[PDB]
Symmetry: C2
Subunit: 77 residues, 2 copies
Amino acid sequence: MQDFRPGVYRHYKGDHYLALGLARADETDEVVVVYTRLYARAGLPMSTRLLRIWNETVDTGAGPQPRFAYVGHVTPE
Amino acid sequence: AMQDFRPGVYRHYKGDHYLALGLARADETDEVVVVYTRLYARAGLPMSTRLLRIWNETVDTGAGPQPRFAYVGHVTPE
């Protein structure tokens, strides 16, 4: 909770997202991350996700990687 | 319901005001939720999320049927 840093993150699949901050999910009283996608696709641009899941390390074909990696306040080209 | 949702300032039926920033998709459940911030002093996380269908429900206290959250524009009262 306390050490979470809102800002731009790169999901392990390659796309960038802007984490606006943490929030309390009313139905379960759990801490979620509120974020918007920084790429074009169809559907709702904003999403939420449990902080504990967002912070997980995930196994991939490219080896262990953070599910979402913090990269600052700007995104690359 | 999504199409009729208007982000902005809402007055919860209990008297306090909140700022709904917009709609969001909860990643785990794929449910549609409202992202909002409280506009009054209290301890805790200022932002919250709540299912759109619950946010849109009507409630009946000791004064008759009324919106759980009533839209009042983009500003809060004096």
